Amino acid sequence: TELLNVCMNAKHHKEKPGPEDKLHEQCRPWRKNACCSDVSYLYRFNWNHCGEMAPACKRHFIQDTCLYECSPNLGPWIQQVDQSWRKERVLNVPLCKEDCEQWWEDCRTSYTCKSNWHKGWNWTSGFNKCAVGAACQPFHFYFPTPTVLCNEIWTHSYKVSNYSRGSGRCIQMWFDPAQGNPNEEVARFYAAAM
């Protein structure tokens, strides 16, 4: 029960969700019941480290960001001993297959310089830049399959699932809250599994 409807904040204290803050207004699905209620990757992470990121690609990263900072349904995957992330450390979140497949396809035309986006950046300038010796290449050079993209980009925060949206066994990065949060059932399912 402790694993359900729970947030870890930027001081690494567990706290309840609440109405979404102003900074996360674009995180629509979470307007009612959010952990984002700053350290936000809505602006503190340079998506354009290798030229302009394509808008179709950038959308997925906004979703990814919203899910990480706002979702009260990642409790089963939160590693409480790890306080090294800006908020929670999650491990092997069962991301829905098509969310990962779409994200991969949509980022084909963008570029990046490394596979693990959680470490190894140069931050000297006040924002993240590719380090000396990290060559910009097509996105799929660093992420040749949706599996490598989803599993490696945030160092195993996600583990892409064989399940698809609607199964109740995978976490999706976005949804229409007017028909309820579909990740709620998934958290409860894995809380029980554990």
Using CB under 6 A as the binding rule, whether residue 131 contacts ligand NAG is answered as yes
Distance of alpha carbon 114 from alpha carbon 187, whole angstroms: 31
The owner of tokens 């307007």 is 31
HSE-up of residue 149 (Cα within 13 Å, Cβ side)? 27
Distance of alpha carbon 57 from alpha carbon 72, whole angstroms: 25
Binding to K ion by CB under 5 A, coded x per residue (else -) over 59-88, reads: ------------x-x---------------
Tokens of 166: 């609607």
Residue 86 C-alpha from the chain's centroid: 12
Other CB atoms within 10 A of residue 175 CB: 17
Using CB under 5 A as the binding rule, whether residue 112 contacts K ion is answered as no
Residue 120 counted as an annotated binding residue: yes
Q: Which does 127 bind (CB under 5 to 8 A by kind): ligand NAG, K ion, none?
A: none
Using CB under 6 A as the binding rule, whether residue 132 contacts ligand NAG is answered as yes
Q: Which does 73 bind (CB under 5 to 8 A by kind): K ion, ligand NAG, none?
A: K ion
Q: DSSP for 80-92?
A: TT---SSS--B--
Using CB under 6 A as the binding rule, whether residue 81 contacts ligand NAG is answered as no
Segment holding 175, helix H or strand E: none
Using CB under 6 A as the binding rule, whether residue 179 contacts ligand NAG is answered as no
Tokens of 60: 């997925």
Q: Which does 132 bind (CB under 5 to 8 A by kind): ligand NAG, K ion, none?
A: ligand NAG
Amino acid at 79: Q
Q: Which is nearer to ligand NAG, 63 or 161 (CB)?
A: 161
Residue 154 counted as an annotated binding residue: no
Per CB under 6 A, the list member of 45, 47, 127, 163 interacting with ligand NAG is: 163
Residues of this chain that interact with ligand NAG (CB under 6 A) are 122, 124, 131-132, 162-163
Which residues are annotated as part of the binding site? 64, 68, 85-89, 118-123, 157
